[PDB]
């Protein structure tokens, strides 16, 4: 029988979500199983669980990010440059590959959306505007990004059937780790500025693997390795949300662990 909003809220409370919390979810809807009203049921449950003073932050990206089409070039290729849509935060759909729940989050009334087209973050709650801006090119997951502010805001990572590789906040640890050999990428995104499309080319840390040994397309990357080690070494509330094995992780603690993990393994 499909899970109801009330059942999910009670499960979230059992896992340790409290009114007023700042939560970043990573969801496998397949693991959760059927929901009374589809994915919206779990969105509504998350909002109820954090309450009217709580906040949700999600990494939603953009269905049409021209990442692969511009990667490695000093400017967008001519055909891309002429016809790609500018990123419009009000209308651009979320990227399906990071979870189908994210499009429901981003379209929720009052949701705010960050300006970085590839790293776009959506937030719901009283602190949403403060969470989502600034989000500049060159600051995808590191200092000055919404992730940085999430980590300063008592953030909790709510993994609902998701694997250790899903922990986006660990890209902050990669950004700040004092290690040699860090990989960077160059790409271009089409922004809206005063109603006009402006292409911006930037470099940033490689979010597909901070060192060569973490950058195999299949993984495992550093996020996955760090998170697997952390979860083997730390008390973390675990329990069901819907049909999904779930965990509620202190974000600052896992990111600090990840910085240490990288710096212990890689020369400065």
Ligand X SMILES: NC[C@H]1O[C@H](O[C@H]2[C@H](O)[C@@H](O[C@H]3O[C@H](CO)[C@@H](O)[C@H](N)[C@H]3O)[C@H](N)C[C@@H]2N)[C@H](N)[C@@H](O)[C@@H]1O
- State which of positions 5-44 bind ligand X (CB under 6 A): none
Q: Which of 41, 65, 114, 246 is close enough to bind ligand X by CB under 6 A?
A: 65
- State which of positions 102-161 bind ligand X (CB under 6 A): 118
Judged by CB under 6 A, does residue 87 bind ligand X?
Answer: no
> CB of residue 207 vs ligand X: minimum separation in angstroms?
4
The number of angstroms, rounded, from the C-alpha of 239 to the middle of its chain's C-alpha atoms is 22
Contact 85, 117 (CB under 8 A): no
Contact 256, 243 (CB under 8 A): no
Task: Decide: helix, strand or coil at residue 151.
Answer: helix
> CB of residue 200 vs ligand X: minimum separation in angstroms?
15
Q: For residues 60-92, b (16+ Cβ closer than 10 Å) or e, as one string? A: bbbeebbbeebeeeeebeeebeeebebbebeeb
Q: How many residues bind ligand X (CB under 6 A)?
A: 13
What does the per-residue mask of binding to ligand X show for 168-207, with x meaning CB under 6 A? Answer: ---------------------------------------x
**Residue 231 belongs to what H/E stretch?**
helix 222-233
27 annotated ligand-binding residue = yes
Q: Which of 11, 28, 61, 120 is close enough to bind ligand X by CB under 6 A?
A: 61
> Is the peptide bond preceding residue 134 cis, with omega within 30 degrees of 0?
yes
> CB of residue 123 vs ligand X: minimum separation in angstroms?
18
Enter the DSSP assignment of 142: S
Alpha helices per DSSP H over 58-132 = 67-70, 78-83, 101-106, 128-132
> CB of residue 239 vs ligand X: minimum separation in angstroms?
23
Nearer to ligand X, 71 or 129 (CB): 71
Judged by CB under 6 A, does residue 221 bind ligand X?
Answer: yes
30 annotated ligand-binding residue = yes
135 annotated ligand-binding residue = no
Q: Which residues sit at the interface with ligand X, rule CB under 6 A? A: 61, 65, 67-68, 118, 165, 207-209, 219, 221, 223-224
């Amino acid at each position: 029988t499909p899970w109801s909003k009330s059942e999910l809220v009670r499960q979230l409370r059992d896992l340790g979500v409290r009114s007023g919390d700042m939560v970043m979810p990573h969801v496998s809807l397949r693991a959760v199983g059927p929901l009374a009203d589809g994915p919206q049921t779990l969105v509504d449950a998350l909002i109820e669980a954090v309450g009217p003073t709580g906040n949700i932050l999600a990494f939603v990206s953009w269905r049409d990010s021209p990442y692969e089409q511009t990667l490695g070039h000093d400017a967008p290729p001519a055909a891309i440059a002429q016809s790609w849509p500018a990123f419009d935060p009000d209308h651009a759909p979320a990227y399906p590959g990071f979870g189908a729940i994210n499009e429901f989050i981003r379209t929720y009334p009052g949701c705010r959306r960050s300006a970085h087209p590839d790293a776009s973050m959506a937030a719901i709650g009283p602190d949403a505007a403060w969470l989502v801006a600034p989000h500049e090119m060159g600051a995808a997951y590191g200092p000055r990004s919404p992730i940085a502010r999430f980590l300063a805001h008592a953030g909790k990572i709510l993994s609902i059937g998701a694997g250790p590789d899903a922990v986006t906040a660990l890209h902050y640890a990669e950004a700040v780790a004092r290690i040699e050999g860090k990989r960077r990428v160059t790409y271009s995104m089409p922004l809206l500025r005063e109603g006009k499309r402006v292409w911006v080319t930037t470099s940033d840390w490689d979010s597909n693997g901070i060192l060569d040994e973490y950058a195999a397309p299949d993984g495992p990357d550093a996020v996955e390795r760090i998170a697997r080690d952390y979860l083997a070494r730390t008390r973390v509330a675990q329990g069901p949300v819907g049909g999904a094995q779930s965990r509620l992780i202190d974000a600052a603690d896992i990111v600090s662990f990840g910085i240490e993990w990288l710096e212990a393994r890689h020369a400065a």
